[PDB]
Amino acid sequence: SSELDKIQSELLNYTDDTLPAMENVDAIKDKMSYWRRTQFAVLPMKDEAQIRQTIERNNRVQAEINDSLVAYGKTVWPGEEEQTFKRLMGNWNAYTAVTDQFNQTLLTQGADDAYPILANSLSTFEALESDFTLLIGILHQAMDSNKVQILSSVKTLNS
Numbered sequence: 001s002s003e004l005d006k007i008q009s010e011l012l013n014y015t016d017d018t019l020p021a022m023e024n025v026d027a028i029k030d031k032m033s034y035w036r037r038t039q040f041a042v043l044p045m046k047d048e049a050q051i052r053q054t055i056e057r058n059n060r061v062q063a064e065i066n067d068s069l070v071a072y073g074k075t076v077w078p079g080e081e082e083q084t085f086k087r088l089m090g091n092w093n094a095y096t097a098v099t100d101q102f103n104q105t106l107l108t109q110g111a112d113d114a115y116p117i118l119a120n121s122l123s124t125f126e127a128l129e130s131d132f133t134l135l136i137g138i139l140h141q142a143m144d145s146n147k148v149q150i151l152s153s154v155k156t157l158n159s
């Protein structure tokens with residue numbers, strides 16, 4: 001019975017913890033990348049109302065990413081995931097500080113003065129990108145470790 005409970009607990013961990021975590025981080029990263037793209041798409045814009053509308057929309061998307069990250073942080077496991085996510089959050093705070101300055105300059109001075117904020121803060125943004133990519137790798141590893149253990153336990157049952 002302790003054998004079956006081991007397999008059932010590892011299946012549950014895989015299906016209800018690991019896979020959701022991976023699906024969620026994948027989706028946050030895709031959203032952040034789209035969000036980043038939108039910050040460059042607002043610069044060629046010429047109508048001020050269209051510019052403000054896009055910034056308001058992107059701030060909503062920023063708040064969704066942030067809420068998703070805060071929610072994810074409550075679930076992180078000690079070790080590589082916690083340390084990686086702690087760093088990711090620091091770089092997220094950094095880039096949203098850049099983004100606040102970018103939005104403010106775009107709306108009060110124009111795209112020509114706002115673009116350099118993006119062009120010159122690449123170290124800040126790539127650090128955030130890199131952390132997402134490391135976190136996804138941790139979860140990819142967890143997915144594979146889960147599978148290996150599930151398969152191994154099917155053996156112990158003598159099945």
Ligand SMILES: NCCCC[C@@H](N)C(=O)O
Nearest residue numbers: 017018021075076077142
């Ligand atoms: N906080 C998310 C953790 C997901 C991976 C974890 N369930 C593991 O088996 O390693």
